[PDB]
Amino acid sequence: TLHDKQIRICHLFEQLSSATVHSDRLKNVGKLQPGAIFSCFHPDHLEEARHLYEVFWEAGDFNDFIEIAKEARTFVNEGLFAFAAEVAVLHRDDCKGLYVPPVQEIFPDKFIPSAAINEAFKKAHDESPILVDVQDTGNILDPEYRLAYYREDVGINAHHWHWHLVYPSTWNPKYFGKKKDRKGELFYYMHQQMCARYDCERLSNGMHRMLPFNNFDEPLAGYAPHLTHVASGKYYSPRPDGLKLRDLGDIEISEMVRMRERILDSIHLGYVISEDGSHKTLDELHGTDILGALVESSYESVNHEYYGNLHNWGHVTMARIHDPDGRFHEEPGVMSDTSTSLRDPIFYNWHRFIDNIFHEYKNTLKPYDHDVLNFPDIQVQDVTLHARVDNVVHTFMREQELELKHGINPGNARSIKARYYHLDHEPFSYAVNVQNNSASDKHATVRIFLAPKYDELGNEIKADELRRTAIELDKFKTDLHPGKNTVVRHSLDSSVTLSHQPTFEDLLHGVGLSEYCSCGWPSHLLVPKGNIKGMEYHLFVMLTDWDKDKVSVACVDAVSYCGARDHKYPDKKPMGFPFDRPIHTEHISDFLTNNMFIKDIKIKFHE
Numbered sequence: 001t002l003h004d005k006q007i008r009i010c011h012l013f014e015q016l017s018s019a020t021v022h023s024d025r026l027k028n029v030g031k032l033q034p035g036a037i038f039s040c041f042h043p044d045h046l047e048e049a050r051h052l053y054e055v056f057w058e059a060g061d062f063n064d065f066i067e068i069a070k071e072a073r074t075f076v077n078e079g080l081f082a083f084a085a086e087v088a089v090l091h092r093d094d095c096k097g098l099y100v101p102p103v104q105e106i107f108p109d110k111f112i113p114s115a116a117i118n119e120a121f122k123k124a125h126d127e128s129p130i131l132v133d134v135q136d137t138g139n140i141l142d143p144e145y146r147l148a149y150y151r152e153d154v155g156i157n158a159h160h161w162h163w164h165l166v167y168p169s170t171w172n173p174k175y176f177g178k179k180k181d182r183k184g185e186l187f188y189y190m191h192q193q194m195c196a197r198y199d200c201e202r203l204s205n206g207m208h209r210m211l212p213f214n215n216f217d218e219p220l221a222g223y224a225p226h227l228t229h230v231a232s233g234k235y236y237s238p239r240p241d242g243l244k245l246r247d248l249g250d251i252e253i254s255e256m257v258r259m260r261e262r263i264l265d266s267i268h269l270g271y272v273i274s275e276d277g278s279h280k281t282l283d284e285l286h287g288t289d290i291l292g293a294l295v296e297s298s299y300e301s302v303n304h305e306y307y308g309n310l311h312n313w314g315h316v317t318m319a320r321i322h323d324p325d326g327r328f329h330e331e332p333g334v335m336s337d338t339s340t341s342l343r344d345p346i347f348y349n350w351h352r353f354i355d356n357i358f359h360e361y362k363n364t365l366k367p368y369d370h371d372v373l374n375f376p377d378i379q380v381q382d383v384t385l386h387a388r389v390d391n392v393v394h395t396f397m398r399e400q401e402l403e404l405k406h407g408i409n410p411g412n413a414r415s416i417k418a419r420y421y422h423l424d425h426e427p428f429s430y431a432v433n434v435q436n437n438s439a440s441d442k443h444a445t446v447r448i449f450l451a452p453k454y455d456e457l458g459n460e461i462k463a464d465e466l467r468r469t470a471i472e473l474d475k476f477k478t479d480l481h482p483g484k485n486t487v488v489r490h491s492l493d494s495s496v497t498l499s500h501q502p503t504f505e506d507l508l509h510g511v512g513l514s515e516y517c518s519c520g521w522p523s524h525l526l527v528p529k530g531n532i533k534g535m536e537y538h539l540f541v542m543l544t545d546w547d548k549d550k551v552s553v554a555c556v557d558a559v560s561y562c563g564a565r566d567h568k569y570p571d572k573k574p575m576g577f578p579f580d581r582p583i584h585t586e587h588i589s590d591f592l593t594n595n596m597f598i599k600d601i602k603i604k605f606h607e
């Protein structure tokens with residue numbers, strides 16, 4: 001049955017660091033040593049991961065796939081293996097309906113500090129349950145340690161791992177049959193929302209918006225991650241203050257400057273150059289997706305030779321800055337890995353730089369006129385946010401526990417849990433009042449966004465600047481009958497959030513329970529933290545005509561950031577509409593058509 005199939009998949013992913021401590025099918029794999037940190041960005045690591053998941057994809061049927069897997073995990077790098085098997089489980093038809101084990105439970109040592117992991121391994125020296133509180137103690141000397149609740153959140157780092165595995169940069173469409181609709185553009189939009197959401201935490205905390213890493217000579221600020229790799233005793237190398245990017249054997253920094261300059265040229269000329277010397281136009285309909293593919297870069301870049309691989313070489317050269325040529329035999333920092341790279345403050349400097357390349361392009365597009373915004377005869381008359389106090393959302397920290405036993409060797413304890421704390425918010429709902437003055441039923445997509453109202457120094461953020469910090473809260477279809485309507489929507493139904501990741505124990509049992517994919521934003525992080533007086537945000541609701549938006553769907557719980565399984569992205573509008581193009585008005589209230597509304601709410605943290 002499917003429940004048996006699920007138990008056999010959980011066992012692929014169990015004590016995977018110990019899994020080490022051949023078949024002509026597995027001849028090109030086994031290059032990266034077990035114990036080494038696997039890079040999700042480096043070309044030669046992604047090549048070996050592709051080779052392994054190609055074997056898994058061509059495995060004649062499910063039992064043959066558990067077999068080759070059970071064997072390849074004996075010798076290949078274990079990070080590489082979790083990567084290749086989760087791409088296989090997501091895409092193989094005979095794995096449909098099967099969940100992959102939670103990644104923070106496969107690799108507990110990437111989500112919890114060396115100190116807690118060591119204490120757990122230590123106190124495992126009866127039968128009894130170990131519990132370690134992660135919570136530390138120390139001289140808080142760095143103001144950045146204030147955003148650690150966001151950067152080091154378990155749920156955000158697990159989402160980023162899972163997104164890059166629904167949308168692989170090595171995805172070859174001709175080999176799979178299958179195309180990933182608007183993969184380049186969703187690369188863009190997901191990493192833009194991670195930056196936009198991060199800048200709402202800086203401003204929540206009284207800090208300035210993050211500045212782009214746009215000059216490659218400037219020294220980086222430092223960050224020590226304090227993560228071990230128990231599979232070998234290696235750690236993610238820390239980065240002290242004041243180092244500058246240095247050439248690696250595989251890439252020179254001047255080659256990166258050169259890729260940036262070639263990309264900006266094409267954006268200012270309106271066309272890119274295909275491999276055959278010909279011109280492809282950066283039209284309004286495909287321009288962001290062509291640019292996503294050559295900036296990341298993916299396998300689908302129109303010209304890899306000429307535009308290179310800028311975003312991904314940025315991860316590799318920042319992760320190796322402590323040892324650019326390998327003479328120290330030191331492991332990369334957390335920027336090498338999609339499960340850890342959001343922890344480092346430098347992630348946001350680099351991805352606001354990359355976002356600025358997409359924004360130059362968006363800036364060559366014409367502002368929307370009233371025609372492309374308006375949904376005529378629809379008028380929005382009111383939004384209210386209902387919570388304990390109406391139009392105030394409350395946030396707070398909350399304790400949680402993570403089970404380490406399926407990922408580190410447990411001996412005889414039945415359970416080693418580490419307890420950590422994370423931001424969370426009270427439940428809320430919206431109520432939108434809409435007047436439908438046609439005399440027919442209409443169908444609307446309701447689009448909901450949140451935007452800070454003022455910067456950290458109390459100045460009003462103008463309309464155009466709001467575009468960079470507006471975060472998506474929801475997108476859903478509603479039918480409207482003639483006359484007055486009131487749409488009610490609950491926060492829990494958010495289409496940017498994962499509603500539930502089942503644990504290893506939920507799954508080996510039948511308690512992980514269609515919506516079986518793990519990509520999606522964490523529910524506890526739906527809104528920014530705000531601050532203890534109540535930080536003011538604009539809440540924007542827009543309705544547009546769904547018969548013009550619409551494009552059997554598994555895995556749509558987080559459609560907005562993750563798309564739909566094996567399906568086209570279900571919204572024809574550009575990702576981030578209405579905020580993706582230049583707004584020529586000083587104030588956001590003068591942008592508003594009748595089918596748009598802003599309500600000012602407050603987010604108020606409780607200490």
Ligand SMILES: [O-][O-]
Nearest residue numbers: 191338341351
């Ligand atoms: O990749 O972020």
Ligand SMILES: [Ca+2]
Nearest residue numbers: 494495497557
């Ligand atoms: Ca959801």
Ligand SMILES: [Cu+2]
Nearest residue numbers: 191311315351
């Ligand atoms: Cu990135």
Ligand SMILES: [Cu+2]
Nearest residue numbers: 160164191338
């Ligand atoms: Cu990423």
